[PDB]
């Protein structure tokens, strides 16, 4: 009885354990597939895009870009400005398996507002988003 309950409980935990792995990986897939790459421009400003294989699709880059924008900068310390520039010249799935990748499908320039003017120069015509 109790032994069965333990067998059932541990088995159901394994079921739930595997389910969350499938769910979490499917939901945070960009973490496993998209490597954020930084190019510090000046001050707090950086150029930001994600790199990876076929699974690092445009959505994954955007999620990867947003993650570091929203984690490497604390608006409650200082307000920040950023822009995410889509690469119109690649499809959502563009990155090949091998390391000779092309232009990223998404790029972002993000910096603290003390550097606001710089972000605008690097963002050019792209909309400036504030956090």
């Amino acid at each position: 009885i109790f032994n069965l309950f333990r067998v059932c409980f541990i088995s159901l935990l394994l079921i739930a354990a595997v389910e969350y792995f499938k769910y979490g990986t499917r939901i945070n897939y960009e973490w496993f597939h998209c490597t954020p790459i930084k190019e510090p421009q000046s001050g707090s400003v950086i150029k930001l895009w994600a790199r990876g294989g076929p699974s690092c699709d445009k959505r994954g880059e955007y999620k990867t870009i947003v993650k570091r924008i929203t984690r490497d900068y604390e608006p409650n310390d200082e307000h920040l400005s950023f822009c995410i520039i889509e690469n119109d010249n690649v499809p959502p799935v563009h990155y090949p398996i091998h390391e000779d990748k092309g232009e990223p499908g998404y790029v972002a320039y993000v910096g603290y507002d003390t550097d606001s003017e710089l972000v605008q120069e690097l963002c050019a015509d792209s909309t400036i988003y504030h956090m």
Binding site: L4, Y29, S55
Partner: protein, 309 residues
């Protein structure tokens, strides 16, 4: 009732099944909206097409049909085969009880086996075709019958593991192998279903089921005394070698040469595409481990075959 409950152990599960089935059908809707459809039928049908997805209700189907098999297990015991063993006049408490364990193995191996073949016949996997195991991977949704098969086997082997862990009868010297057989069979059934390897696992399950059918049928006659015991045992070696070794090796080889070339091979967690260079060692290890166990069993059958001669 209580007196009937003890003598006819199947009564209690039988009452639940007839009640839930009656409640489900008396509800009128008898569709996915019914809370009892959570249990009595397979859920997550893809619109009206013959393909069902996976989700929490699958366990509700499995749990409910653990009760169903608990009835069927105990019902066939008390009403069908135990009288048959008395009709055969075994006249031995231990020998008869074991012969029951094997006779029940005929009923379910003799039903699931042909059912797995009927499913696989109505699929592109026919005759253990290893390419289809991987072309359509991930198979995130299953046909009606494959979902019925996988959850039905998960429901069946969960009940068998459930009663075994309860130890309603004093464990025998082979209790360890029964635990391993049930826990490993459940793990393979669950892993293949959860990770969208149902097409691969149906072929492997058919081999393990079909060979077992002949194992129990061969073993059953060994408990008896008939001229058919060597004949069925001879049929068993043919089916064991072909299914547990020839087919499973071919499935093993495909995990090394069609895991990569058939279907998508780039890992993509977004799309649940787990067939990749990381899963290949795992699938190979699992199937190879099963074959290694099969080889150990093959050693037993081969030495028991020399003792037969």
């Amino acid at each position: 009732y209580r007196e009937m409950n003890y003598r006819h152990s199947w009564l209690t599960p039988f009452f639940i099944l007839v009640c839930v089935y009656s409640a489900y059908f008396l509800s009128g809707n008898r569709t996915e909206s019914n809370p009892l459809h959570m249990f009595v039928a397979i859920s997550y049908q893809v619109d009206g097409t013959d393909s069902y997805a996976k989700g929490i209700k699958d366990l509700s189907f499995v749990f409910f049909y653990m009760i169903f098999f608990t009835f069927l297990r105990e019902f066939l015991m008390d009403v069908v085969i135990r009288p048959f063993t008395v009709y055969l006049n075994v006249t031995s408490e231990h020998r008869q009880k074991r012969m029951l364990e094997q006779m029940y193995a005929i009923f379910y191996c003799g039903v699931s086996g042909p059912f797995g073949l009927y499913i696989m016949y109505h699929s592109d996997l026919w005759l253990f075709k290893t390419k289809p195991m991987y072309r359509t991977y991930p198979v995130i949704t299953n046909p009606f019958l494959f979902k019925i098969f996988y959850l039905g086997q998960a429901a069946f082997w969960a009940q068998q593991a459930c009663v075994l862990v309860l130890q309603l009868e004093k464990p025998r010297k082979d209790y360890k192998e029964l635990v391993f057989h049930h826990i490993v069979t459940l793990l393979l059934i669950w892993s293949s279903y959860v990770f969208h390897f149902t097409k691969m696992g149906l072929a492997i399950y058919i081999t393990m089921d079909v060979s077992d059918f002949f194992l129990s049928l061969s073993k059953t006659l060994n408990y008896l005394n008939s001229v058919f015991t060597p004949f069925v045992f001879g049929l068993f070696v043919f089916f064991w070698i072909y299914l547990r070794h020839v087919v499973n090796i071919r499935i093993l080889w495909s995990v090394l040469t069609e895991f990569r070339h058939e279907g998508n091979y780039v890992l993509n967690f977004a799309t649940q595409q787990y067939k990749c260079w990381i899963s290949l060692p795992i699938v190979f290890v699992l199937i190879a481990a099963l074959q290694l166990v099969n080889l150990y069993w093959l050693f037993l059958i081969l030495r028991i075959l020399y003792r037969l001669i």
